[PDB]
Design a protein around this nucleic acid. Sequence first.
RNA 1: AGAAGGGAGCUUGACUGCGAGACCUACAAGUCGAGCAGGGACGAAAGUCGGGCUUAGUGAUCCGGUGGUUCCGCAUGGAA
RNA 2: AGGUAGCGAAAUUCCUUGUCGGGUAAGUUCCGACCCGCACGAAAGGCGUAACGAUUUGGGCACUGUCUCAACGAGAGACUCGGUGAAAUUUUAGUACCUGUGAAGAUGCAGGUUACCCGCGACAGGACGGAAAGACCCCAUGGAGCUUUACUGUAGUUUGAU
RNA 3: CAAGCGACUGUUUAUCAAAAACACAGGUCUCUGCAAAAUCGUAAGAUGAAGUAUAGGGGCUGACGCCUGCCCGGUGCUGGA
RNA 4: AGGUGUAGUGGUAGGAGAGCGUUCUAAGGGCGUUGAAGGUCGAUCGUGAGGACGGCUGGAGCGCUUAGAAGUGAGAAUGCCGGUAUGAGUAGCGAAAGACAGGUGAGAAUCCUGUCCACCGUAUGACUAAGGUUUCCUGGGGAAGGCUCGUCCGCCCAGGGU
RNA 5: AUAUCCGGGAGUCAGACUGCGAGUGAUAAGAUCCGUAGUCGAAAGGGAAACAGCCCAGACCACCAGCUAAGGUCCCAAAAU
RNA 6: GGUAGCGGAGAAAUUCCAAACGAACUUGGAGAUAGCUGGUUCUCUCCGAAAUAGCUUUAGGGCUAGCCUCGGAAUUGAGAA
RNA 7: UUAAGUGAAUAAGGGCGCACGGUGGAUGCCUUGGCACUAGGAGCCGAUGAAGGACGGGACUAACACCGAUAUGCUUUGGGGAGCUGUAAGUAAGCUAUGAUCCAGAGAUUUCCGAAUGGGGGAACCCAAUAUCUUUUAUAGGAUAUUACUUUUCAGUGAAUACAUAGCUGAUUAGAGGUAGACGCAGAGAACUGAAACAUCUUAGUACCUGCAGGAAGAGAAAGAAAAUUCGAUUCCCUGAGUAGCGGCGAGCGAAACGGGAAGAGCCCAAACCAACAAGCUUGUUGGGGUUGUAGGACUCCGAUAUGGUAGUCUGUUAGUAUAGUUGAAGGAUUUGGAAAAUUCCGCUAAAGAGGGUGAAAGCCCCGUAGACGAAAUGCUGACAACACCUAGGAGGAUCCUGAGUACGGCGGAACACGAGAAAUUCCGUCGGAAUCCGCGGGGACCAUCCCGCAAGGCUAAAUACUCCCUAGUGACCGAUAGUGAACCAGUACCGUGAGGGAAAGGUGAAAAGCACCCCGGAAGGGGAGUGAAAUAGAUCCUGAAACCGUGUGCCUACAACAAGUCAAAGCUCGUUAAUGAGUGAUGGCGUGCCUUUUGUAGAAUGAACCGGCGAGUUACGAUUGCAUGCGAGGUUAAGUCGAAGAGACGGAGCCGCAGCGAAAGCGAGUCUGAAUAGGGCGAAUGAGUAUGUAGUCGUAGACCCGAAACCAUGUGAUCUA
Lengths: 97, 118, 154
Amino acid sequence: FEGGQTPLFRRLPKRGFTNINRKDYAVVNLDTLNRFEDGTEVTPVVLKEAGIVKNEKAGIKVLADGELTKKLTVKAAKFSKSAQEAIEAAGGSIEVI
Amino acid sequence: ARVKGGTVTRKRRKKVLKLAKGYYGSKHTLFKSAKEQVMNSYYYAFRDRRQKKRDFRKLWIARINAAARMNGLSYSKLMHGLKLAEIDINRKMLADLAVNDAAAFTALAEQAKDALSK
Amino acid sequence: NRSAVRGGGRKPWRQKGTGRARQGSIRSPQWRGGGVVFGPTPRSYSYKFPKKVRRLAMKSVLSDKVAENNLVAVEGLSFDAPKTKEFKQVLANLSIDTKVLVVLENGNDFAALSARNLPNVSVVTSDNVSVLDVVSANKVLATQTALTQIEEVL
RNA sequence: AGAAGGGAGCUUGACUGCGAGACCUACAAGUCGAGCAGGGACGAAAGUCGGGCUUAGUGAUCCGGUGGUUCCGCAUGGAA
RNA sequence: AGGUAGCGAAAUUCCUUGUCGGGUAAGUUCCGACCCGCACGAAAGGCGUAACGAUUUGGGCACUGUCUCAACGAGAGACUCGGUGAAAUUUUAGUACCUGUGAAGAUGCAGGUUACCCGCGACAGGACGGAAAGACCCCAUGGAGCUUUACUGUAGUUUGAU
RNA sequence: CAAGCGACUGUUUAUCAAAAACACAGGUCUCUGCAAAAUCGUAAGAUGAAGUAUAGGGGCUGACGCCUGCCCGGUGCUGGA
RNA sequence: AGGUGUAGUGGUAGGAGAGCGUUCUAAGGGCGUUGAAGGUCGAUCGUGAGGACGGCUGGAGCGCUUAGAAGUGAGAAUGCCGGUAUGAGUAGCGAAAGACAGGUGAGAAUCCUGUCCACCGUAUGACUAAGGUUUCCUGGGGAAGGCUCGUCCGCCCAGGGU
RNA sequence: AUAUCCGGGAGUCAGACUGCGAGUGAUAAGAUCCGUAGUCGAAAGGGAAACAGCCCAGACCACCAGCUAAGGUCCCAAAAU
RNA sequence: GGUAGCGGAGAAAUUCCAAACGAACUUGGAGAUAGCUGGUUCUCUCCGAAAUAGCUUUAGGGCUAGCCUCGGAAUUGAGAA
RNA sequence: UUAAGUGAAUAAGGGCGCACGGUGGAUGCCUUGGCACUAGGAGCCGAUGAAGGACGGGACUAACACCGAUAUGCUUUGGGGAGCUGUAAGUAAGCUAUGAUCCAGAGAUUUCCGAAUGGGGGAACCCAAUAUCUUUUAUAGGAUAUUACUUUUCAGUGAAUACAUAGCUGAUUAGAGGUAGACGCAGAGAACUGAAACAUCUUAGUACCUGCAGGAAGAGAAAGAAAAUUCGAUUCCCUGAGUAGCGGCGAGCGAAACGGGAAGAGCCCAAACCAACAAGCUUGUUGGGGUUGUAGGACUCCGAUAUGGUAGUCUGUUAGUAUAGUUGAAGGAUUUGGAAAAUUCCGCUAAAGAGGGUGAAAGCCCCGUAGACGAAAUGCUGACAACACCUAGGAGGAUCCUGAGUACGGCGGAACACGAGAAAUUCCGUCGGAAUCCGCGGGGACCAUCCCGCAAGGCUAAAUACUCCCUAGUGACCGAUAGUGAACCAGUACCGUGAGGGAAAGGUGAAAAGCACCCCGGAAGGGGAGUGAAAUAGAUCCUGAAACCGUGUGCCUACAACAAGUCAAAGCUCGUUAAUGAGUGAUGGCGUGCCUUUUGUAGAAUGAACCGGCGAGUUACGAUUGCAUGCGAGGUUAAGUCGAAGAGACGGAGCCGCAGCGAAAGCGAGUCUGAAUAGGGCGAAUGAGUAUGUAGUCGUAGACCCGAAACCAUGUGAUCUA
Ligand SMILES: [K+]
Ligand SMILES: [K+]
Ligand SMILES: [K+]
Ligand SMILES: [K+]
Ligand SMILES: [K+]
Ligand SMILES: [K+]
Ligand SMILES: [K+]
Ligand SMILES: [K+]
Ligand SMILES: [K+]
Ligand SMILES: [K+]
Ligand SMILES: [K+]
Ligand SMILES: [K+]
Ligand SMILES: [K+]
Ligand SMILES: [K+]
Ligand SMILES: [K+]
Ligand SMILES: [K+]
Ligand SMILES: [K+]
Ligand SMILES: [K+]
Ligand SMILES: [K+]
Ligand SMILES: [K+]
Ligand SMILES: [K+]
Ligand SMILES: [K+]
Ligand SMILES: [K+]
Ligand SMILES: [K+]
Ligand SMILES: [K+]
Ligand SMILES: [K+]
Ligand SMILES: [K+]
Ligand SMILES: [K+]
Ligand SMILES: [K+]
Ligand SMILES: [K+]
Ligand SMILES: [K+]
Ligand SMILES: [K+]
Ligand SMILES: [K+]
Ligand SMILES: [K+]
Ligand SMILES: [K+]
Ligand SMILES: [K+]
Ligand SMILES: [K+]
Ligand SMILES: [K+]
Ligand SMILES: [K+]
Ligand SMILES: [K+]
Ligand SMILES: [K+]
Ligand SMILES: [K+]
Ligand SMILES: [K+]
Ligand SMILES: [K+]
Ligand SMILES: [K+]
Ligand SMILES: [K+]
Ligand SMILES: [K+]
Ligand SMILES: [K+]
Ligand SMILES: [K+]
Ligand SMILES: [K+]
Ligand SMILES: [K+]
Ligand SMILES: [K+]
Ligand SMILES: [K+]
Ligand SMILES: [K+]
Ligand SMILES: [K+]
Ligand SMILES: [K+]
Ligand SMILES: [Mg+2]
Ligand SMILES: [Mg+2]
Ligand SMILES: [Mg+2]
Ligand SMILES: [Mg+2]
Ligand SMILES: [Mg+2]
Ligand SMILES: [Mg+2]
Ligand SMILES: [Mg+2]
Ligand SMILES: [Mg+2]
Ligand SMILES: [Mg+2]
Ligand SMILES: [Mg+2]
Ligand SMILES: [Mg+2]
Ligand SMILES: [Mg+2]
Ligand SMILES: [Mg+2]
Ligand SMILES: [Mg+2]
Ligand SMILES: [Mg+2]
Ligand SMILES: [Mg+2]
Ligand SMILES: [Mg+2]
Ligand SMILES: [Mg+2]
Ligand SMILES: [Mg+2]
Ligand SMILES: [Mg+2]
Ligand SMILES: [Mg+2]
Ligand SMILES: [Mg+2]
Ligand SMILES: [Mg+2]
Ligand SMILES: [Mg+2]
Ligand SMILES: [Mg+2]
Ligand SMILES: [Mg+2]
Ligand SMILES: [Mg+2]
Ligand SMILES: [Mg+2]
Ligand SMILES: [Mg+2]
Ligand SMILES: [Mg+2]
Ligand SMILES: [Mg+2]
Ligand SMILES: [Mg+2]
Ligand SMILES: [Mg+2]
Ligand SMILES: [Mg+2]
Ligand SMILES: [Mg+2]
Ligand SMILES: [Mg+2]
Ligand SMILES: [Mg+2]
Ligand SMILES: [Mg+2]
Ligand SMILES: [Mg+2]
Ligand SMILES: [Mg+2]
Ligand SMILES: [Mg+2]
Ligand SMILES: [Mg+2]
Ligand SMILES: [Mg+2]
Ligand SMILES: [Mg+2]
Ligand SMILES: [Mg+2]
Ligand SMILES: [Mg+2]
Ligand SMILES: [Mg+2]
Ligand SMILES: [Mg+2]
Ligand SMILES: [Mg+2]
Ligand SMILES: [Mg+2]
Ligand SMILES: [Mg+2]
Ligand SMILES: [Mg+2]
Ligand SMILES: [Mg+2]
Ligand SMILES: [Mg+2]
Ligand SMILES: [Mg+2]
Ligand SMILES: [Mg+2]
Ligand SMILES: [Mg+2]
Ligand SMILES: [Mg+2]
Ligand SMILES: [Mg+2]
Ligand SMILES: [Mg+2]
Ligand SMILES: [Mg+2]
Ligand SMILES: [Mg+2]
Ligand SMILES: [Mg+2]
Ligand SMILES: [Mg+2]
Ligand SMILES: [Mg+2]
Ligand SMILES: [Mg+2]
Ligand SMILES: [Mg+2]
Ligand SMILES: [Mg+2]
Ligand SMILES: [Mg+2]
Ligand SMILES: [Mg+2]
């Protein structure tokens, strides 16, 4: 309350809408995948047991923030293009579930 | 738990009343009157510890002035002359000599008069 | 509070003209017999530390007893029938005269019965042992199986 | 008046995306802006042009109208 | 559609104690009259009116302590004594005057002046005395009652369809 | 003796106003054909009336005497449609 | 742990910091009929809130240390309740006639008796409805009630009465 | 020897007088309204007789010690008749 | 005996309805709301304002900023004279 | 001698200090009673007369408690073992080992009023009818029973009116009122308030009123939730989430599903069809049959009369359990004292060292406690038995059935978090109004497709809510101004016409041993003498503060203008927590209270008569910051289960953090804008979080405390007055 001056929120427009079908993915970066040994099968189940991803939301999405250094066969709902290149550049492989 | 008033209230007021012993009527009897007068007494006592220093210097100077004139000199000229003679005796001591040891006060006065002439 | 105290609905006297202080109820808090302002209200005082903190606290008191050599482990405490004098003699056998927490394995009814009446003894079972239990005792007297059970619990 | 005043030709920059940095300022706002790109006007070129000598000519949000839209579309395709 | 009859300085006339006449030694009131009716007027009736009125208003006779102007007497209280015994109020008070000062009107501050201690009967100038959280005044995006061609509703009434 | 106001007897602000205020008989307007209009009530049921237009309701005026002029554009009411 | 040096140390609203005291809880360690708490007095200690120690009173409980929790601190609210003042021995003691003798009694202007006097008498008499609800009668009483008093009472006690 | 910046907690939104510079006012007001400095507010002490706002000056405390500020030195009343 | 509070009754005065009636009394919603007035209880230490701007159905209220306080970060030291 | 000068003492009264009293009832200690809860019990009582009352009952009886004309008790069955006739003494008269009083189970009695109910009525009163009995010669008198109203069923009478029906009489049957000031469902439904005004909105579907309940209620067995592909009645808890949404898009309002738990349970009808009966080929009654969505059933075929289940019954039997009880270890001295439990000395008991009482503080004195044990009677529960009641498989579709004035629609309202909105879903009023298995409904306007279901019929335990009462306990809850209004004869006294409002008031002592007797006094009251450890513990009785009132007197005071103190100070009087002491104080200097509110108050502004007690930032849930601890790219569980109303364990559902950018599709250490490899915004680069504690502040709540005028909703009043 501003003592009767039109409050800041009334001065500003409402914006946007919420998508009923909105899908939000649980983000996993490459530096987090360095925690698994070479040849590991990294899975949403494996990540849940590791405690890395407690809530996968609409699914696991892998992002290329850090540098990956181990060879893995990574399974996830989505892959950023850079993350796919890094995983395969490390001699691993990706699979969309 | 519940904390009832207890004895702290009475203890505190009794201390104030003790400070008010000898005050007139209700001022030594009733806590509110006694507390108000004890506060005023504190205000006076602090102020008067400064004033007593003024009052005694006023007394000594007046007594030194009377003794100075009995030696052919005013107070102000005597203190100028004593300063010229490098005498550091203070007014409490001078007033005491003025009353109790007049011969010594005269000897001081002569030194001051000598210093004034020089 | 003023709403819970009996009566007091009506205004004691008119707002103006009587020369009295204005009052809205005979149960107002400054009245004798009026409602209490604030004051106690029923509530819980319990809260839960993180589990890891609970575990560390329990190990600390147990490790403190050992560090001071106040943990007296006995092979077993057997009694054909519960008799306080006998357990009292066991405490003398082990030279325990101070407050002691006697920690017994489950099912040792007769040792618990014979120990509990002694004013300086506190009895627990190995699976119900709390930090307050341990800290209160100057000494802990634990049977061998009780110690093993504790180590399985923790 | 090295015009910002006056006349004439061609024009539509009274451009689109913007914008380092400043001024002003409780906030919300208000003001100036080099420069970059797109596509231009005038000019031989330099260059000037994001209205007018400068500073007034204005009104938040909510709610509605109209136009556009590679956005969403409550099982799905549509629609609303 | 422009106020007629009647009345009119009026329970209405501001100017206003209008003006003139009467009444008085002297009449801002009263009565009679005049009519520039600020701003009378015919059923929110006009004008008049015998009788009536604890009605308003002016004059007169009688009468008087109303007054000139106050005096005396009776009783009740007051006063003294015996009995009985409240109240409002109250920061503590050993509680003067003048001039000044100061939140601009001080028993209390300054300067000066006056004043032995304690009461009793009296009086009210002050204690901005007591009584009541000013009623006037303003304010509160207070309250209540009232009004309407304020807003929004609504009981009722009415009209149509079913 | 005289003037204002109210015709009159009455009535009223229990507790600051008894009056020139209210009422009044009289006047006038208007509604009401009876399951009247009007009013109390969601209704049933009542009052109006066990009355019936010379009666009942409502508005205004206010004994009596003499009188009560002009305006229907406006607003209401009534009728028309 | 302290020491030196320089500087600083008025303060409303208000911010920060650090403490005093109250009741209760836990643990520890203690004190109490050889006198706890509380009360009261004293010339006591600390920079402050406050803390001891003695005497007296008192007659059962209560400190201390550390930590915890709080209905945790009053001088003001025309605060609430209680007590007691001030005004005061003051206002008032509620429309009127009583006097004296004798009696009763611890005590009588005030109770009883007598005498005269005085007051009401379309009443202050005699009935009765309501209302009250034991106030009626008799014998005792004098704390309170009675505006004084009281031996008396519409009061109190004990009996009775329609 | 402070400045910014980030964050927790406020309080304040009646100001007053004095000097100086202006307006309003009658170049009246202890008036009103700004600017500017100070004091009061929230500041005790000394001086101005008394006297929030003027002059001197900022009280952590003790002293029966000294020096000064404004202002003073014939008596009240300290100090040069 | 009848009429009862969104009411009754009123020869009409805001008149009466159990000693205050522009709308009774009682209990409840209920600790109504109160930008208003009053009150708000131990101590010492450190620091210490404001009475201004902007906006406000706003003017004795509020909000952001200014001014106070506490903590923190950091720089070629950015403050003051 | 004279003159001039100086000059004490004195107090009518007053002041200060001190001592001792009175008044008063603070304080301390204590407690009869309260407050908040936990576990279990029980969750209703009434026409077989309730709740609540009135009036009565005792050797004397005013009150309370008990009881009811069988009255301070009766019978009976158990328990119990020496006293008893309540509070309450006193006298009196009695009872009890042939078992009293007392305790528990079961019965008897139970006046009058009150729903009240034969009629009436101003409750606790009055007045009847009929039958039987009784009193009197008889009338009068007395006793017992029956007699309200409506409902259900049956019978009998019986109108207008023919048969009938209505009415009427009787019988039968069942309701009628009260609560527990709670909890549930439903009808009806405010206002102050918030929105800084206010009509939408909010307060709220709250308060109030009314109906119906039940021990719980309600809901409940998919015309569901969904679209991970699936789940499989309902209820409740955690979470989702202050999210999606709603909203003068304001103030505010605010889900649901999924996930995790508690608890779990399912079943009966209508219709088709069959059979029987009755009636006017159908058209009713009864019984069978049948019960649904991977459609079921009828029907027609075959085939088994089994096997399982139960939310049945005063069916017994049995066990347990509630309602009385029994038993239950161990100390003596010594010191102090009135008294020992304190103390000292040696002992002992403990399945009991919980607690209470006892002449102070007791494991061993008492009541108890741990433990063991006990039931004639009546409940309650569980089994077991009995009995009753339900329970068929498979294959066929020709035909038949599967809830109509219903679904649904228009209009007007309401409920859904959802305010008509694009508004689905549910309901109410009004009008219109389907299909029916090749059908119908839902998946948030609507259509198609797909998927999920099968309305218009009913019932149903548990998990949930609440506590007037009962039993056993608990408390960093109260300790008489508190705690219930009420510790005490309190919903009383008292106030009010009434509704209604509503107090004050606890403490002798270990024991009354409550002061024989004497003395003054009419008494009251004192003084002795006694009792007692103490009476200055004497009933107004523990402690006994202050205001206030008084007595004694060390110092001062009758020339002085004084917020009354302070600083300086003679004199006098005293001697300490022994301190460069105490009280008083002539005289001198200085000096306008406290608080609030103000630019500024000694203020001639406010508040306080005084003293004492009480009296105001709290708690819960959330937000956020500081501090602290644990763990750390991680941190952490919630409900719940076990457990002492504890810690703890389990529980990973969920929540925060680890990735941002965008309205969004979406991309991602980037992303959005843009044509843009540009620029710019926000981010990353350039990492610290999270749980809990603690404190500061805020938000929702009365939110620091007190105060309006008023508003609304039930009631109470015309004994005043119109
Ligand atoms: K041109
Ligand atoms: K005229
Ligand atoms: K006129
Ligand atoms: K004349
Ligand atoms: K007249
Ligand atoms: K008259
Ligand atoms: K006379
Ligand atoms: K003043
Ligand atoms: K006077
Ligand atoms: K009013
Ligand atoms: K009249
Ligand atoms: K008349
Ligand atoms: K007339
Ligand atoms: K009259
Ligand atoms: K009238
Ligand atoms: K006429
Ligand atoms: K008429
Ligand atoms: K008219
Ligand atoms: K008439
Ligand atoms: K007209
Ligand atoms: K017309
Ligand atoms: K003492
Ligand atoms: K408090
Ligand atoms: K007070
Ligand atoms: K008095
Ligand atoms: K007095
Ligand atoms: K008598
Ligand atoms: K100035
Ligand atoms: K300053
Ligand atoms: K009247
Ligand atoms: K800050
Ligand atoms: K004297
Ligand atoms: K009855
Ligand atoms: K209840
Ligand atoms: K409203
Ligand atoms: K408001
Ligand atoms: K049910
Ligand atoms: K939420
Ligand atoms: K709004
Ligand atoms: K069947
Ligand atoms: K004991
Ligand atoms: K049994
Ligand atoms: K809808
Ligand atoms: K659906
Ligand atoms: K479905
Ligand atoms: K005593
Ligand atoms: K004295
Ligand atoms: K003095
Ligand atoms: K005043
Ligand atoms: K960028
Ligand atoms: K870009
Ligand atoms: K941390
Ligand atoms: K925190
Ligand atoms: K509050
Ligand atoms: K708060
Ligand atoms: K009446
Ligand atoms: Mg107190
Ligand atoms: Mg209340
Ligand atoms: Mg008063
Ligand atoms: Mg209370
Ligand atoms: Mg779709
Ligand atoms: Mg859809
Ligand atoms: Mg004239
Ligand atoms: Mg004359
Ligand atoms: Mg004339
Ligand atoms: Mg007229
Ligand atoms: Mg007319
Ligand atoms: Mg007339
Ligand atoms: Mg007298
Ligand atoms: Mg002046
Ligand atoms: Mg003056
Ligand atoms: Mg003075
Ligand atoms: Mg002065
Ligand atoms: Mg006055
Ligand atoms: Mg006022
Ligand atoms: Mg008249
Ligand atoms: Mg008359
Ligand atoms: Mg009157
Ligand atoms: Mg009169
Ligand atoms: Mg008239
Ligand atoms: Mg200083
Ligand atoms: Mg205590
Ligand atoms: Mg308190
Ligand atoms: Mg007080
Ligand atoms: Mg007097
Ligand atoms: Mg008299
Ligand atoms: Mg006579
Ligand atoms: Mg007569
Ligand atoms: Mg008599
Ligand atoms: Mg008698
Ligand atoms: Mg008397
Ligand atoms: Mg001024
Ligand atoms: Mg101020
Ligand atoms: Mg000063
Ligand atoms: Mg001041
Ligand atoms: Mg001098
Ligand atoms: Mg000279
Ligand atoms: Mg009027
Ligand atoms: Mg009245
Ligand atoms: Mg409310
Ligand atoms: Mg400072
Ligand atoms: Mg505005
Ligand atoms: Mg039941
Ligand atoms: Mg027996
Ligand atoms: Mg009857
Ligand atoms: Mg509002
Ligand atoms: Mg025993
Ligand atoms: Mg012993
Ligand atoms: Mg809604
Ligand atoms: Mg539908
Ligand atoms: Mg419909
Ligand atoms: Mg299906
Ligand atoms: Mg159930
Ligand atoms: Mg009480
Ligand atoms: Mg007490
Ligand atoms: Mg009480
Ligand atoms: Mg004593
Ligand atoms: Mg006593
Ligand atoms: Mg003199
Ligand atoms: Mg003298
Ligand atoms: Mg002022
Ligand atoms: Mg004052
Ligand atoms: Mg004064
Ligand atoms: Mg006062
Ligand atoms: Mg009534
Ligand atoms: Mg009546």
